[PDB]
Subunit: 124 residues, 3 copies
């Protein structure tokens, strides 16, 4: 169905797909970050999103950033009921120092289909 | 539509959803753990789970822990057929020693719906729009 | 229903499995130093079935014993190139991957392909902006 979103500021960019059948919607940064080596930043999208029923939005890493700059994505479980600013938890591993500019595609968002089951205790 | 669990000891805590439409059931540590900086640990829940069909259980990181304490979850693929202790592999990437107390919610379990496809070898695959495109080919901006 | 693959070289091994993942086999030998990464080639190309992507996921044995993790991991339905496994070596030791070692697994994650629609404001929820620990520690 529909991935509804709203901007929270002029700095936000609409999620965009890299190709017709890309799994993820790229998420852009709303600000500049300087993230030191072996550090973490919570990067802001300045968007709230409303995920379709029966899924959640998984923040996943891009492969170019992972493979080329040693960037990972922490956290990344966006719940169907979350109406706040979507944050991307980025990990800068390895040497150097990762530089994020406003408008940078730093992750991607996937509508992972899940169950919400009732839980029931019974008796590598 | 039903996630079955059994307690493996008296130190287990029934998993619980943080909100009405939370993607994950939070998993509780069964023991005290001290994870040094740049180190890992398999945290025991002391529960066994029977996931419902057509899904597996992904052990996923919580965002407070990752944002505030630089904690990640490694591994994470609980198979539908697994009946042992559900273990949470925590990575402490922070400079801090991280203290896990018995009863702390240190991860969440998501029932990811999946296919169980048959694998078939073909001689060559056909081209598409993406093609061999990948690893930052579409760019940064 | 069906996962099609073709070998891109004689060094590829057919993935193998109610396991959620088909284990992916390295095509070559790699040495990954401490606190470093590598793109390990499988030398296979895949055609995932519709309505799913292929997530490259870590195996728990290599994670628990050797501090191995998988970065990236989003194989799109329309990708036709060499499936590459981005291995992260967070351990203090160098990690030796030999050709034929199962270094990852591939999961066919069912997903939606929704249309993106900008609205002025969204419906509200109980959760609301709560996130990043707002439900507490225990
Ligand atoms: O990468 C993320 C992960 C989570 N979040 C927000 C959205 C999500 O709905 C909310 C809760 O995420 P988790 O349940 O994964 N984290 P945690 O359990 O720490 O937060 P809470 O106690 O509120 O449930 O935090 C982000 O903005 N970015
Ligand atoms: O985070 C995890 C990951 C796996 N496990 C357990 C449950 C799972 O069904 C079992 C197998 O997981 P993987 O296949 O992902 N790892 P590996 O391939 O190393 O183990 P095995 O060879 O037995 O399949 O390990 C956990 O308890 N926690
Ligand atoms: O772990 C991975 C991730 C991606 N890939 C390939 C397949 C995927 O379809 C393609 C692009 O994947 P991502 O979109 O996740 N990475 P990125 O967005 O940087 O590449 P691109 O800009 O081309 O989309 O790269 C791998 O082989 N292994
Ligand atoms: Cl949402
Ligand atoms: Mg992409
Ligand atoms: Mg939560
Ligand atoms: Mg396995
Ligand atoms: Mg990861």
């Amino acid at each position: 169905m529909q991935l509804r979103f709203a901007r929270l500021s002029e700095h936000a960019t609409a999620p965009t797909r890299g190709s017709a059948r890309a799994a993820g919607y790229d998420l852009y940064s709303a600000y500049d970050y300087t993230i030191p080596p072996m550090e973490k930043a919570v990067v802001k999208t300045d968007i709230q999103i409303a995920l379709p029923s029966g899924c959640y939005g998984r923040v996943a890493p891009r492969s170019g950033l992972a493979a080329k700059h040693f960037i990972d994505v922490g956290a990344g479980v966006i719940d169907e009921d979350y109406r706040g600013n979507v944050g991307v938890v980025l990990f800068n591993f390895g040497k150097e120092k990762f530089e994020v500019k406003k408008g940078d595609r730093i992750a991607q968002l996937i509508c992972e289909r899940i169950f919400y089951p009732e839980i029931e205790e019974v008796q590598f």
